[PDB]
C-alpha cells in the first residue's frame, strides 16, 4: 500500500489544519521515498519548520527549502540532487504533488501542491503524490498568496510525519 504522510500547517504560528498526502510509491518509488523521509525527518533534516515560500492562487503552493529558508535551498535524501525518475504521472488537477526543479535531473526537496490542472508541466516535473485529505486547508493557504507567490502571512509546516 502507498504511504500516507501529513503536514500540520500554521499561519503566523497559529494552527490552520492538516493536509495528508498519498505518495505514489508504486509508480515513483525513489521520488516518493525522498518526500516520505523528509516528512518524517528521519535523516536528521526535512520539512518540519519550513515555510511555503511561493503561493500563487489558482496555480500552486510551493515549499521545501529547509536548508536556506530563502526559496533557493533544499536537498534530497540521496544528496544535493537526484535524477528525474520518470514522467509516468501527469498534472491532472488540484491536489497533485510534484517536484520543483531548475531543469532536468535537479530534484532536491522543493515541491509544489497544484491547485489546478497544470498539463503544461507534464514531462518537465515529476508527479509523485496527491492530497488525500485537507484540500480545504490547501485552499485556505491560497488566500494568502499573490501574483508571483510572495505570501501575506507566514505559512509553515509546523509538524509533519507519516501516518499508520
Amino acid at each position: 500500500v502507498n504511504p500516507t504522510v501529513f503536514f500540520d500547517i500554521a499561519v503566523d504560528g497559529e494552527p490552520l489544519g492538516r493536509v495528508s498526502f498519498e505518495l505514489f510509491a508504486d509508480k515513483v518509488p525513489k521520488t516518493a521515498e525522498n518526500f516520505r523521509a523528509l516528512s518524517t525527518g528521519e535523516k536528521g533534516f526535512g520539512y518540519k519548520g519550513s515555510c511555503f515560500h511561493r503561493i500563487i492562487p489558482g496555480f500552486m503552493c510551493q515549499g521545501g527549502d529547509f536548508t536556506r529558508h530563502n526559496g533557493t535551498g533544499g536537498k534530497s535524501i540521496y544528496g544535493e540532487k537526484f535524477e528525474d525518475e520518470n514522467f509516468i504521472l501527469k498534472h491532472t488537477g488540484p491536489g497533485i504533488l510534484s517536484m520543483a526543479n531548475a531543469g532536468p535531473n535537479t530534484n532536491g526537496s522543493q515541491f509544489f501542491i497544484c491547485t489546478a490542472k497544470t498539463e503544461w508541466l507534464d514531462g518537465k516535473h515529476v508527479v509523485f503524490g496527491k492530497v488525500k485529505e485537507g484540500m480545504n486547508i490547501v485552499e485556505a493557504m491560497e488566500r494568502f498568496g499573490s501574483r508571483n507567490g510572495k505570501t501575506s502571512k507566514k505559512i509553515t509546516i509546523a509538524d509533519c510525519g507519516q501516518l499508520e
Binding site: 520543483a100 526543479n101 509544489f112
Partner: peptide, 11 residues
Amino acid sequence: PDCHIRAYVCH
C-alpha cells in the same frame, strides 16, 4: 528551482 513558475509567467 522555479522552472514551473517561469513557465507560468511566460504562459
